[PDB]
Amino acid sequence: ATGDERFYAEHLMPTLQGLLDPESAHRLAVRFTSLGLLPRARFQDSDMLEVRVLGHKFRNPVGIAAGFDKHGEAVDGLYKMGFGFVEIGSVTPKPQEGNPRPRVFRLPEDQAVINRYGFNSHGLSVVEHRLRARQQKQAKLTEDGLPLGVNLGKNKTSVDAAEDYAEGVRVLGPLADYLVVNVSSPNTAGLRSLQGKAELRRLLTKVLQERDGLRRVHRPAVLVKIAPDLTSQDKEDIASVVKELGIDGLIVTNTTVSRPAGLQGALRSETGGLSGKPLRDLSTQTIREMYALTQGRVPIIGVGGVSSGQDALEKIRAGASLVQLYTALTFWGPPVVGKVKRELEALLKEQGFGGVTDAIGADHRR
Numbered sequence: 001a002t003g004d005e006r007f008y009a010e011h012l013m014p015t016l017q018g019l020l021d022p023e024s025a026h027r028l029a030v031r032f033t034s035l036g037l038l039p040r041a042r043f044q045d046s047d048m049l050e051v052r053v054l055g056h057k058f059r060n061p062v063g064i065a066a067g068f069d070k071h072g073e074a075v076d077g078l079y080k081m082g083f084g085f086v087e088i089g090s091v092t093p094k095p096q097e098g099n100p101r102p103r104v105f106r107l108p109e110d111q112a113v114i115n116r117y118g119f120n121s122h123g124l125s126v127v128e129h130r131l132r133a134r135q136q137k138q139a140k141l142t143e144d145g146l147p148l149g150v151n152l153g154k155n156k157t158s159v160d161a162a163e164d165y166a167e168g169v170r171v172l173g174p175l176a177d178y179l180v181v182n183v184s185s186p187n188t189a190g191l192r193s194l195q196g197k198a199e200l201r202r203l204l205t206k207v208l209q210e211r212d213g214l215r216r217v218h219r220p221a222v223l224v225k226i227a228p229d230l231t232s233q234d235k236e237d238i239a240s241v242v243k244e245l246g247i248d249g250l251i252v253t254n255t256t257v258s259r260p261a262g263l264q265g266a267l268r269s270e271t272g273g274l275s276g277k278p279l280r281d282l283s284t285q286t287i288r289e290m291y292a293l294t295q296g297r298v299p300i301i302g303v304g305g306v307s308s309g310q311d312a313l314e315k316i317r318a319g320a321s322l323v324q325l326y327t328a329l330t331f332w333g334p335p336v337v338g339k340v341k342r343e344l345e346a347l348l349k350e351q352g353f354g355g356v357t358d359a360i361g362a363d364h365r366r
């Protein structure tokens with residue numbers, strides 16, 4: 001309800017965030033979500049929100065982005081809050097602790113977060129066993145239109161980046177509906193340089209060879225997640241490699257190392273990736289560019305600063321088939337998920353679209 005949204009947004013979450021620093025709050029949220037405990041959200045998804053892409057049906061196009069459930073501990077609880085799909089990770093091959101604390105910062109006056117977690121990860125083996133313990137349950141959820149994505153990273157000290165990603169394909173590929181090759185974290189030395197043309201072609205050739213070697217019912221789609229901070233040359237190169245190799249999709253975008261003019265939060269000059277509202281339109285414009293460079297033929301998951309139905313529809317009209325959110329959940333709590341879906345349905349009807357599918361890329365056809 002708007003009453004439930006208001007209680008969370010004006011009383012419960014402001015109070016808890018005043019008592020808990022963001023990393024402690026994040027850990028408590030994941031732990032609590034994993035317990036189930038809470039009933040499924042009220043909103044009932046209508047037919048016009050269904051999307052068929054990446055070889056799967058999505059009951060609604062609003063997902064939880066990577067980095068909230070880094071280790072696969074709260075998947076079922078996230079479906080209960082109404083997300084149409086869940087992405088876990090990033091997961092590294094070996095366990096690692098990430099950067100020293102403090103490493104997460106809130107910018108309440110900007111509705112933004114800065115983080116430098118550094119790929120803290122339980123590692124592939126632990127996550128593999130966690131997902132195996134619910135693998136058949138996930139198979140039924142996927143069949144019912146609730147797919148699962150797994151986001152892969154690399155270890156800090158690894159010498160061969162491509163072998164780190166290949167290991168992730170072999171270990172978690174068989175448990176995923178789609179895999180994400182995350183070459184865009186700002187918080188690992190040298191990672192984003194994997195976005196260049198030659199490095200990217202060789203890396204993605206190896207990743208796709210590994211994927212194709214899996215048995216057919218265990219063969220996921222493969223997407224690449226890119227930064228919002230790329231040059232025009234970088235974007236044309238990514239688009240060329242994606243089409244050359246047959247990559248299945250793109251996730252647009254990760255956090256930004258830029259600091260837009262106008263930020264007010266005291267913590268705006270901390271090192272790390274910036275998320276939330278100051279990222280929104282930079283991400284939407286990157287979606288627009290990548291859709292055009294790929295001729296509308298490559299599915300895009302749009303992410304960055306989504307907290308309303310209007311935010312979601314703007315990314316869909318720019319070229320996204322699905323959207324994700326994270327930072328808005330940390331400020332407004334679970335009710336934001338139903339709010340986005342309710343507003344999106346109303347806007348689709350007001351703008352004369354028969355459903356989400358009809359609106360994908362519509363800005364490009366004006």
Ligand SMILES: Cc1cc2nc3c(=O)[nH]c(=O)nc-3n(C[C@H](O)[C@H](O)[C@H](O)COP(=O)(O)O)c2cc1C
Nearest residue numbers: 065066067089090115254275276304305325326327
């Ligand atoms: C605290 C935090 C941790 C994140 N960790 C990851 C990660 O491990 N892997 C990844 O691909 N993206 C990660 N992200 C990026 C989000 O998936 C998303 O791309 C970005 O935050 C923009 O969406 P938002 O504005 O709705 O938060 C993280 C973001 C935040 C805020």
Ligand SMILES: Cc1cc(NC(=O)c2c(O)nn3ccccc23)c(C(C)C)cc1Oc1ccncc1
Nearest residue numbers: 016017022025026028029032033104329330333334
């Ligand atoms: C959904 C949610 C999230 C959060 N908090 C965070 O996840 C959080 C934060 O506050 N800052 N932050 C910065 C970077 C990354 C994450 C975060 C909290 C805190 C305030 C306790 C409560 C939540 O309510 C729930 C959870 C589970 N079941 C029902 C209701």
Ligand SMILES: O=C(O)c1cc(=O)[nH]c(=O)[nH]1
Nearest residue numbers: 117118119185187255273
């Ligand atoms: O530090 C991380 O783990 C991290 C942060 C972020 O914003 N994006 C990402 O891919 N990783």
